[PDB]
Amino acid sequence: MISLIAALAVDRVIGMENAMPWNLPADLAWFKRNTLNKPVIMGRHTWESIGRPLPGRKNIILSSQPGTDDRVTWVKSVDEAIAACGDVPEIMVIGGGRVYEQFLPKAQKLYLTHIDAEVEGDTHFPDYEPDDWESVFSEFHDADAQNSHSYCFEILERR
Amino acid sequence: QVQLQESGGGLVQAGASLRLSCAASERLTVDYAIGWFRQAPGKEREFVAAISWGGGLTVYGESVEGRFTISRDIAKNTMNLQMNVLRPEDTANYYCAASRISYAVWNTIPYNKLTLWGRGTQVTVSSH
Ligand SMILES: Nc1nc(=O)c2nc(CNc3ccc(C(=O)N[C@@H](CCC(=O)O)C(=O)O)cc3)cnc2[nH]1
Numbered sequence: 340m341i342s343l344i345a346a347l348a349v350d351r352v353i354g355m356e357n358a359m360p361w362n363l364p365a366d367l368a369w370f371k372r373n374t375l376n377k378p379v380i381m382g383r384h385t386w387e388s389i390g391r392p393l394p395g396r397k398n399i400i401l402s403s404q405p406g407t408d409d410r411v412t413w414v415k416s417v418d419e420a421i422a423a424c425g426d427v428p429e430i431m432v433i434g435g436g437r438v439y440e441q442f443l444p445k446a447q448k449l450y451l452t453h454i455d456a457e458v459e460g461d462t463h464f465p466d467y468e469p470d471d472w473e474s475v476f477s478e479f480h481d482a483d484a485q486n487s488h489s490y491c492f493e494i495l496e497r498r
Numbered sequence: 499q500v501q502l503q504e505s506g507g508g509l510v511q512a513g514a515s516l517r518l519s520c521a522a523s524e525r526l527t528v529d530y531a532i533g534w535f536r537q538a539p540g541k542e543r544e545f546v547a548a549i550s551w552g553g554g555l556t557v558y559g560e561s562v563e564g565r566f567t568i569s570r571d572i573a574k575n576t577m578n579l580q581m582n583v584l585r586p587e588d589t590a591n592y593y594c595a596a597s598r599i600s601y602a603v604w605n606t607i608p609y610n611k612l613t614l615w616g617r618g619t620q621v622t623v624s625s626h
Contacts, residue, residue: 354528354529354552355528355529355552355598355600356550356553356600356601356602357528357529357530357531357550357551357552357553357598357600357601358528358529358550358551358552358553359552359553360552360553360554360555361553362555384529384598387598387599388529388598388599388600389599389600389603390599390600390603390607390611391603391607460528
C-alpha cells in the first residue's frame, strides 16, 4: 500500500522547514516512528532541505532531472518510484506539495499532523475529499516547553 | 548567483560585544536559511549560528549558546549576529553562508554542502 505523511497548518498550508514557523520535535518523532524501516519517496526540494539521507529508510527522490547525489536513489516517474520500493507492505510518500499531489490518487492511507498555526504560504497539501476518507486515529497535543504549537496526529484510510 | 557580503569584524577586548552583518545581493526565498561559520588558524571550520529565512527560527553552536543572537530582516534582505561577552577563543575569520538546507541541520552538516559563501570577516578578541 501507498501512504502519504505530512504536517499541515490551517487551510492545508505546508512547506519546507525553513519556511514554516513551527518547531515540533514530537511531530518529527511521529514522522520517524511511522517512516522508519520503510522506503520514503520525496521531491527534490525536500531532499535539498534534509541535506542527507533519512537514516533507516530507503531514500528515493522523484525528479524529472538527473540525480546529483549517489547516496540515494533517483527516479523520473511515479510508476518508477513505486517499482524502486519493491515488495514492501507500505510505501511512505513524504512530499512536498507537488509530490503529494502526484501520489494521492494511488494512496490508501494518510498520516496528517494538523498544526494549530495560521501560516502565509503558497504550497498546500492536495485537496483530498474528506468524505471519501475515514478517520481511524486522532490524537491531540497541547504546545509545551519543547513544541511551539498545539498539534493533532491523524490517520485516515481511503473508504 | 546570490552573493553574501560580511561586515562588522574588528578587534575588541575580552568581555566586549561585536555585531556582524551579512547582506545578500538578491532576495532570499522563504525556503532558505542563512548563518555563520567560523574558522581560526589551524582549526577546522565550525558552525556558529543559523536562522531560517521564512520562519525566523534559530539554532546555535554549543560554544556560543546564550552569548550570541542571530536575527534577520526580510525587507532589508540582511542578517545580523550580535556577539556578547566575547572570549579570546572566539577569535576567527567569520563566514556568512546561505542554503536551502534546513537551518536545524546546520550544526552537523558538512560545511561544503552549503554553496553560497561570503569571503569572511576577521574577529579578534584580545586578553592583551
Ligand atoms: N508529520 C510530519 N511532520 C513533518 O515535519 C514532515 N516533514 C516532511 C518533510 N520535511 C522533513 C523535515 C525534517 C525531517 C527530519 O529531520 N526527520 C528525522 C527526525 C528525527 C527525530 O526527530 O527523531 C528523521 O529521522 O525522520 C524529515 C522530513 C515530510 N513529512 C512530514 N510529516
